[PDB]
Amino acid sequence: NKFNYTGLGGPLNWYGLDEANEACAKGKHQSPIVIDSAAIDYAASGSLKLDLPLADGSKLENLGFGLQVTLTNGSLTANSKTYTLAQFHFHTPSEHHVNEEHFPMEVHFVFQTAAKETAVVGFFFQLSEVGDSVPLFDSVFAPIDNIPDAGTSTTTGQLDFGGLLDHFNRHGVYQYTGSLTTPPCTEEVMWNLSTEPLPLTVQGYNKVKKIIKYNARYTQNALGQDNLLEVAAQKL
Amino acid sequence: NKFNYTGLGGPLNWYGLDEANEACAKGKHQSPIVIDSAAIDYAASGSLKLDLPLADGSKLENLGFGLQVTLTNGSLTANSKTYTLAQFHFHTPSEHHVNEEHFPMEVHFVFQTAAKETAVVGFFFQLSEVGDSVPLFDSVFAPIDNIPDAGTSTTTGQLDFGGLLDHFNRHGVYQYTGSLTTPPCTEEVMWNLSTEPLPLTVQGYNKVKKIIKYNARYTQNALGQDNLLEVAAQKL
């Protein structure tokens, strides 16, 4: 079983899957982590510029333990450095936790530079009592019925990020420097996580969960601290 | 940080918390596991007798990363061996997965014999689109507003298991022999998991999630297979 979440294919043994995954197991700045709201840094106001232009239907694919939209119109400007949008995707349950609390879902918008430096913009989802939703993501999730098998793809509706955008702009942004949450867990990723969760509906949550199944990396040691697999490796 | 889920206090380093936790790290039959519905054994019909008599309000306590009801009126008879009820409690997200799919919540009813042999009866929860609930668990969850702090306790309403009972009786029961999902992860636990998830409401899920935060052990290697920490233990 290749790049999985289960057993021998899962995070505890990604390094054993291919030596190119050293970071996964030896990294001292691995992601996800448990964010301590009263301890992280918050992106300073006006240090972060997120551009997400209206897009036409785009490739939504069943990764197999994953659900990803491919989209290349978008940017994130962190002070002087500009990253351009590669794709966005979903995890269920969330990968990060806040004050130890997890969430039913997390979105990752992945950006890069020509130097292949990476930055992420993430959002947390929280089930809405009142049935509220994010039309953007409704639009994204609409076609899921078309891609039940891993390795198949389809096309979303028009993606309008107006709402997402100014949600991101109206709220704080947890910021830290970590890694990819998938192999090879490359470090030096710039993490930017909106502090305020988006509405999610039961219908949507179940729809997605059934496709993705489970695709979250367990949380890591604190930043700088030994990868907590190397910690476990003493013994013996 | 003592018996946690976060970093140094979490499952990857429980053994390092106290030598009495060897199984956590060296066990070949650790729980939870990913259940493969077309591969596990189903409890044979009439091999399992679950008795849950009506109960008065009982001690609901905030474990800290846990929510547990203490109750001693109940039994589970597995052929000729009778286990008596110690307590039941909740995990969010679920700890087990079915065909790799996780669930927002799992309940554990823990039973024992005088030989301190253990058996569990577990139920999966799935968010109900239509707002449906299990009155039993509604009754259990009612008082949560009283126990925000870890180490505090309160008292449930009357607990009537009529519904739960015959749900358990009307459905299959995944069965396998594993371990405790908490230290010291003692092995030889008799696992019995109802195949059919209970209704859960957004209101309830969020209420609980905020109290428990996150309290699920990552899934283990297959049964008999090396604990997948010992697997990770090559090298350094």
Ligand SMILES: *[C@@H]1O[C@H](CO)[C@@H](O)[C@H](O)[C@H]1NC(C)=O
């Ligand atoms: C990306 O931008 C270009 C330039 O405006 C445009 O031609 C194209 O439609 C955009 N891509 C999508 C899929 O919206």
Ligand SMILES: *[C@@H]1O[C@H](CO)[C@@H](O)[C@H](O)[C@H]1NC(C)=O
């Ligand atoms: C347990 O059983 C005893 C005897 O039936 C009964 O008096 C008592 O109410 C029960 N405990 C609770 C809290 O329901």
Ligand SMILES: [Zn+2]
């Ligand atoms: Zn991701």
Ligand SMILES: [Zn+2]
């Ligand atoms: Zn449990």
